[PDB]
Design a protein around this ligand. Sequence first.
Ligand SMILES: N[C@@H](C[C@]1(C(=O)O)C[C@H]2OCCC[C@H]2O1)C(=O)O
Length: 256
Amino acid sequence: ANRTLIVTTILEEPYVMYRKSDKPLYGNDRFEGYCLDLLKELSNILGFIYDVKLVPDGKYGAQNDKGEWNGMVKELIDHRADLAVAPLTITYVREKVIDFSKPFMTLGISILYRKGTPIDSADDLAKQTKIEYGAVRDGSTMTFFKKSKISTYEKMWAFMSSRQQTALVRNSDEGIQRVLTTDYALLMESTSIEYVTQRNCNLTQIGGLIDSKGYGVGTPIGSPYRDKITIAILQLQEEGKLHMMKEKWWRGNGCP
Ligand SMILES: N[C@@H](C[C@]1(C(=O)O)C[C@H]2OCCC[C@H]2O1)C(=O)O
């Protein structure tokens, strides 16, 4: 039989979440969400079963000064996993070290904050000195700021980096908690801002999208699966299945 594929992933609502049950759940049955449905579809099309393993360090992946990676990206580089199926952003720096499938979703960075301030943009946020801001540590949003040559974003990176201990949060849940409980705005991918702001009416998006990019399935460079997964993703795209999956997991509007 085809070897069971190892899937690296990360907890991130509504992509990957713990299923609620009053009885024991084991293995893949512990998880549900958009990415689990995606795996069910992809595996049907490609003819494999899989083992879902949460990334040990709880990170998406960034490289340090030595050029060393962490998170799901490192799991792929080191061939610890066959596939990464998560809200994993397709980026230039990552594409040089892993293979991505074609995108299954598009999005852009924006700002999550509480309601009631005059901040209307990243420019406004960088200029003012009352509200702190940051991003999830060792994700693509952090990297966007680190690599930016746009002045506002260079300043925002210097600020985040100077206050890294508090400004760069461990994960999105910590970021949202910091937004809700302190004077802190989180730079966050838009599809997740859409999800949370329809669930917690104290939260809002500030400004528009700062960039535009996609999520893709990650594989190690040279993987024989990448092209097959790309073909399957295009099938799901064209058949309207990706759209249906988004509707299923984001439904539906809960706030004014
Ligand atoms: N998709 C990003 C991770 C992350 C970001 O760096 O913006 C953190 C996490 O934050 C909540 C939205 C989904 C995720 O995006 C990445 O692939 O590194």
